[PDB]
Amino acid sequence: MESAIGEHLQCPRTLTRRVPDTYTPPFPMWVGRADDALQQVVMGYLGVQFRDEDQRPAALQAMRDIVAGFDLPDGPAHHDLTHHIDNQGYENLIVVGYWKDVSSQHRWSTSTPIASWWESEDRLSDGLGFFREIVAPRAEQFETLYAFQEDLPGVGAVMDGISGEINEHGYWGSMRERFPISQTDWMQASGELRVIAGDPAVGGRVVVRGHDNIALIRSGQDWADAEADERSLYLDEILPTLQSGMDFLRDNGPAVGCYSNRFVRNIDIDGNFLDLSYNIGHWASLDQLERWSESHPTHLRIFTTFFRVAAGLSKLRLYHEVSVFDAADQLYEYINCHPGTGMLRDAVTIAEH
Amino acid sequence: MESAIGEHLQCPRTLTRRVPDTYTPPFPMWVGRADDALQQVVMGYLGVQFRDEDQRPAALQAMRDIVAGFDLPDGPAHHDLTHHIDNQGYENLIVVGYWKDVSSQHRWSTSTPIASWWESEDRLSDGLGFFREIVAPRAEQFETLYAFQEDLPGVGAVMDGISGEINEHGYWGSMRERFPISQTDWMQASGELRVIAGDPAVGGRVVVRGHDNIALIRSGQDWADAEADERSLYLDEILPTLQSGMDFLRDNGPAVGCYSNRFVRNIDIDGNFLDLSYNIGHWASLDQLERWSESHPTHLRIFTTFFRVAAGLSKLRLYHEVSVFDAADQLYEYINCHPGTGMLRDAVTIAEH
Ligand code: HEM
Numbered sequence A, B: 001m002e003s004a005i006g007e008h009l010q011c012p013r014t015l016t017r018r019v020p021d022t023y024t025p026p027f028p029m030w031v032g033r034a035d036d037a038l039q040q041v042v043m044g045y046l047g048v049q050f051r052d053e054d055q056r057p058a059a060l061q062a063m064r065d066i067v068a069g070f071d072l073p074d075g076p077a078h079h080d081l082t083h084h085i086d087n088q089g090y091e092n093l094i095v096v097g098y099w100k101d102v103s104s105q106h107r108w109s110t111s112t113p114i115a116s117w118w119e120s121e122d123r124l125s126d127g128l129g130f131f132r133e134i135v136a137p138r139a140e141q142f143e144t145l146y147a148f149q150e151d152l153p154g155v156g157a158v159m160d161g162i163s164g165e166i167n168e169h170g171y172w173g174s175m176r177e178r179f180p181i182s183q184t185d186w187m188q189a190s191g192e193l194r195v196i197a198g199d200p201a202v203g204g205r206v207v208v209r210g211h212d213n214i215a216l217i218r219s220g221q222d223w224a225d226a227e228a229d230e231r232s233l234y235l236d237e238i239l240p241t242l243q244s245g246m247d248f249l250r251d252n253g254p255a256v257g258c259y260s261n262r263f264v265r266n267i268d269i270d271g272n273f274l275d276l277s278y279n280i281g282h283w284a285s286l287d288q289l290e291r292w293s294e295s296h297p298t299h300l301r302i303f304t305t306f307f308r309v310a311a312g313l314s315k316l317r318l319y320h321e322v323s324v325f326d327a328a329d330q331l332y333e334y335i336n337c338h339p340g341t342g343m344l345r346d347a348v349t350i351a352e353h
């Protein structure tokens, strides 16, 4: 069988898998493929936050301004738009951009139209919240998994194509093994999520730095092309269990090591909902993510519910991408967001250390 | 933290764990310890089988004869007695003995009073079924896990003591990592479960040989010391899930790679029930046992229910022992047993391979 790890990323092992090499997965799954040109990507989650209805026009315009900047030289190779309401009752529009290299994203961010917009006094006077959560995993530091082969969302869209059926899935610990770095590295978390400028409690501009091997999961659901009975199966049987799990991570984050949990629905440029959704989850460690997925009743309920109704599925599209990052390859910037936004909730404040 | 692997069995690794060094389990568990003298143990399951009520006195007396043989030189260091009814309606009394070394068990088994009884033509004429399922893992080939510290049942009873709190538990795959041989070996199954003498379809004396890395789990429950409120919790909430899982494995064995599944209840010498039970499960591979425990809805139901009710438990005792063996260290012998008994069911006959 094909391996989840790209040919060019395969190397002499020092760390080994948890299954013997006779292992054969019980069902087909696929991963994104890319050659050695794709060395390190940039995932940039750009947000607009508001709570009052009268702020919606301004927020939607801000989102449109951000998307317009994505067309400029060195804009991202791919992007999508989402909406969610957080546990403080704030609406959040997030545009996620994927760049195929670090220098392009840097040239983009430092260009006049983009840099003057982000540094503008308008950002403090708009009354909206703004954030940028920008992470740059190397090709060895992310893994994908798709229950389909065509039209890959997320990071898959900036990769070169699709694999054949892969071996490293269908057992807990398989996510870890799909990370090419797992051949060598434990991806052990160390350090603190830290405020380096400002104060969350006062608002204004706040900058947060990450620590070694923060993990980010984007796990998605696409039911747009499903027919009547299958859509009914996702909506009636699968989603309530998924919602319960998302609610748990959103409201019990510190207890399990989840810095931020967002359950988001795709939108068009006008804010209308599309039949695609995903979790955006930031974790204190890959291993804390492993433990929750494999042993918390919430994901296990999702897991067993899936296999119970799996026979009636065919058009539903389920996938995830998971990334870990060097300490230095992350920045989380906030402007006028509430103190529980993203990395602001759990970051250690400047006095605190 | 202490390791589940005895100090004298720790060696340079070719195979690694699935958790980083920082891993700390969320609840305490302990393992049996034995010093460098213990090199290989013997687990001898000696059974008496019958279905007619008029056979019960002879069956219980045969069980007493077996227990009496344990008082002879080189008898086992520990034993216990159990009862179950199999899916063919036969009652099975099983006396399990544990020996601290292979040679002592061999000396006992070949001694005149023991060998003459097993080889007697009276075993054919008794009308009862008899069986000996005797397996001998090296110290590097078995692991134990106890959710308690005192009065170890099973193989723990013949070990030297109890460990402190251990690191290698609380995640799927931890069982494998508690096997000292996992440091260097995949414990990959190979070969066939083979009839080597006799014919299961004709009855009489049948002899079955195991293959490399068959796995045997004894997973036990002891509620004898629990008070009323906890007794009800186990019997009403936990036991039904366990029963469901055991029935599944008993009746769908070939589908999941479980050669033989028994859910047995401890009894005293007179056949009266005790409030201790355990699974005796023989598996085609350790990894099939891994797959079932971690991903089959039956054990996941057991596992999720346990953590749901865990707060109401304190005196309930849960544990397991899991072993793998070379082909040569397994002997499965049957006298007038029905053809679904233990390893008779799935064994390949002389010309089938
Ligand atoms: C309806 C939605 C979901 C379904 C049906 C589902 C189902 C599953 C399945 C079947 C697997 C095993 C995949 C394989 O290896 O073949 C899996 C793995 C995993 N899922 Fe989910 N999941 C869902 C949503 C989520 C979400 C929102 C998260 C975010 C925390 C999540 C986290 C994980 C992780 C971390 C793994 C990897 C476990 C490992 O390989 O060690 N899942 N999921």
Ligand code: HEM
Binding pocket: B029, B168, B169, B170, B171, B172, B173, B174, B175, B176, B217, B219, B221, B238, B239, B242, B279, B281, B289, B290, B293, B294, B299, B302, B303, B306, B318
């Ligand atoms: C009411 C009875 C049972 C309960 C409450 C239960 C619960 C659990 C728990 C909590 C664990 C995790 C232990 C740890 O690592 O800390 C576990 C592991 C395991 N259980 Fe069960 N269990 C029960 C019965 C059984 C039975 C009868 C079997 C027979 C196949 C079984 C097979 C396994 C295996 C093979 C593992 C190891 C998983 C691994 O580390 O990869 N369990 N069980």
Ligand SMILES: [Mg+2]
Binding pocket: A185, A326
């Ligand atoms: Mg590193």
